[PDB]
Amino acid sequence: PQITLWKRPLVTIKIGGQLKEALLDTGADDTVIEEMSLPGRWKPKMIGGIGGFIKVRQYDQIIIEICGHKAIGTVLVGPTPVNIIGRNLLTQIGCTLNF
Amino acid sequence: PQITLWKRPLVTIKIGGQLKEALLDTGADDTVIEEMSLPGRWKPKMIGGIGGFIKVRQYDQIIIEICGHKAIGTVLVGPTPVNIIGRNLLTQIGCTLNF
Ligand SMILES: Cc1cccc(C)c1OCC(=O)N[C@@H](Cc1ccccc1)[C@H](O)C(=O)N1CSC(C)(C)[C@H]1C(=O)N[C@H]1c2ccccc2C[C@H]1O
């Protein structure tokens, strides 16, 4: 699809068999989702945003669908204000900025 | 142009007679620039994201140029770690997400 930016670019994602809302976020290097269960081992990561830094859990090779497009990649879990789909997964689904 | 997301989508902007590098950020409602002087009145504002909130000064009706595209809109000035072009200016240059 072509998504304009007059409103927040909110989309539906599927992760762990569940539907969630997330923001397509070109300013995010990585993808961050609110507290939830994911399988496997995790490693620590720090990420810095407009207000400072937060600690998150990094899960690798996670199955995720973004507006029906299938991706498999890294997903961070932590106290993010909103679920964010960052460049690591935007590149997987072939998303570009255009003007 | 068409801008891929393998790297951070950084562009050169002209604002207040100055050249700055900034991030094309679909996750930001508004545009925020590191400390600089801008003409006219301003109002204080709090903006929030990962890691919480920062206080900025809101300047309205500020002219900017991004890759040959002039626009006008609100610009926030404050202690942002990265200069960010948000949706309020991205719309005006006709920027979209496509996949
Ligand atoms: C995930 C990650 C991993 C590794 C490295 C980096 C840089 C990562 O990205 C971190 C990040 O937070 N990224 C931010 C942008 C960013 C990058 C670097 C430093 C600081 C911030 C993300 O894109 C984003 O905007 N966001 C994120 S939360 C949000 C959707 C509310 C939005 C935001 O702040 N929006 C608020 C905002 C921002 C600017 C102006 C106005 C407003 C109002 C509100 O809408």
DSSP letters spanning A2-54: EE-SSS--EEEEEETTEEEEEEE-TT-SS-EE-S----S--EEEEEEETTEEE
Residue type present at position A23: L
Chain B: residue nearest A89 by CA? B5
Q: CB under 8 Å, gap of 24 or more: what pairs does A41-48 form?
A: A42/A77, A45/A76, A47/A76, A47/A78, A47/B50, A48/B50, A48/B51, A48/B81
3-state SS class at A87:
helix
Task: Please count the residue pairs, one from chain A and one from chain B, whose beta carbons lie less than 8 angstroms apart.
Answer: 131
Write down the residue that tokens 């300013």 correspond to.
A27
Q: CB under 8 Å, gap of 24 or more: what pairs does B68-77 form?
A: B69/A99, B69/B93, B69/B94, B73/B31, B74/B30, B74/B31, B75/B15, B75/B31, B75/B32, B75/B33, B75/B38, B76/B30, B76/B31, B76/B32, B76/B33, B76/B45, B76/B47, B77/B32, B77/B33, B77/B34, B77/B35, B77/B36, B77/B38, B77/B42
Distance in angstroms between the alpha carbons of the first and the last residue of chain A: 15
A27 close to A50: Cβ distance less than 8 angstroms: no
What does the H/E/C string look like for chain B? Answer: CEECCCCCCEEEEEECCEEEEEEECCCCCCCEECCCCCCCCEEEEEEEECCEEEEEEEEEEEEEEECCEEEEEEEEECCCCCCEECHHHHCCCCCEEEC
A25 assigned to active site: yes
Q: What tokens appear for A94 in the block?
A: 């072939």
As a whole number of angstroms, the distance between CA B85 and CA B57 comes to 16
Residues of A with Cβ-Cβ distance to B33 under 8 angstroms: none
Kindly provide the resolution of this structure in angstroms, with one decimal: 1.7
Report CA(A4)–ligand 1 centroid distance (Å): 19
Residues of A with Cβ-Cβ distance to B97 under 8 angstroms: 2-3, 5, 9, 24, 26, 95-98
Pairing of strands A69-77, A52-66: antiparallel
Q: Which residues contact A24 (CB under 8 A, 6 or more apart)?
A: A3, A9, A10, A11, A66, A85, A90, A95, B26, B27, B97
Write the CA distances from B93 to A20, B69, B80, integer angstroms: 30, 6, 23
A48 Cβ closer than 6 Å to some ligand 1 atom: yes
As a whole number of angstroms, the distance between CA B52 and CA B33 comes to 17
Q: Which domains does chain B have, with CATH numbers?
A: 1-99 (2.40.70.10)
Q: List the determination method.
A: X-ray
Q: Which residues contact B19 (CB under 8 A, 6 or more apart)?
A: B12, B13
Report CA(B93)–ligand 1 centroid distance (Å): 21
Q: What tokens appear for B81 in the block?
A: 């770690």
As a whole number of angstroms, the distance between CA B56 and CA B78 comes to 5
As a whole number of angstroms, the distance between CA B76 and CA A56 comes to 28
B75 close to B4: Cβ distance less than 8 angstroms: no
User: Chain B contact for A81, CB < 8 A?
Assistant: yes
Angle at B71 between CA A52 and CA B63, to 5 degrees: 75
Q: What tokens appear for A73 in the block?
A: 């990649």
